[PDB]
Amino acid sequence: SGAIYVGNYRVVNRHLATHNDWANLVWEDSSRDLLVSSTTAQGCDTIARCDCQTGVYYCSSRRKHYPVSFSKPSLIFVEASEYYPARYQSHLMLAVGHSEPGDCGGILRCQHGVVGIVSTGGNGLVGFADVRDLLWLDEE
Numbered sequence: 105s106g107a108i109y110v111g112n113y114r115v116v117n118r119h120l121a122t123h124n125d126w127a128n129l130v131w132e133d134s135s136r137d138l139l140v141s142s143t144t145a146q147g148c149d150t151i152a153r154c155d156c157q158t159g160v161y162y163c164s165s166r167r168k169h170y171p172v173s174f175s176k177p178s179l180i181f182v183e184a185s186e187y188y189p190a191r192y193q194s195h196l197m198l199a200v201g202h203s204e205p206g207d208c209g210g211i212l213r214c215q216h217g218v219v220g221i222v223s224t225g226g227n228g229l230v231g232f233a234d235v236r237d238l239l240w241l242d243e244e
């Protein structure tokens with residue numbers, strides 16, 4: 105579990121959005137596993153605007169922040185699960201690191217800000233849904 109809070113936005117994994125998030129929807133993309141909902145209060149997160157491939161992510165299954173190298177956002181094959189059929193997930197970055205399903209929502213950060221949130225994994229790999237191309241998160 106976990107979310108990004110920037111301005112009047114809550115960014116969460118689409119497969120984990122609560123009923124309250126759907127009743128206050130801004131934008132969603134099934135192919136990226138992202139959903140953005142409106143918030144009454146202002147958030148403090150700054151989104152990174154860069155091409156960094158090294159950062160630190162939070163892993164709830166180990167209660168640890170791990171430094172990692174990660175790939176460029178890409179269309180990656182994600183196996184069928186209870187949340188989606190077998191498909192290509194876009195804007196996904198992989199890293200060698202421990203991750204388990206309950207780790208989704210963990211933030212990945214670089215020196216510039218929030219890069220993305222855990223969305224996939226397994227096999228000593230962890231995948232992050234990128235949010236750095238969502239330039240509109242920095243306005244209104």
Ligand SMILES: NC(=O)[C@H]1CCCN(C(=O)[C@@H](CCc2ccccc2)c2ccccc2)C1
Pocket residue numbers: 119137182183185187188193203204205206207208222223224225226230
């Ligand atoms: N974005 C998605 O479509 C997610 C939805 C939840 C499930 N997804 C994952 O990647 C799972 C592992 C799936 C798996 C298990 C066993 C064998 C082959 C695959 C996972 C593991 C670790 C961290 C986060 C998620 C896909």
Ligand SMILES: [Zn+2]
Pocket residue numbers: 152153154155156214215216217
């Ligand atoms: Zn950066």
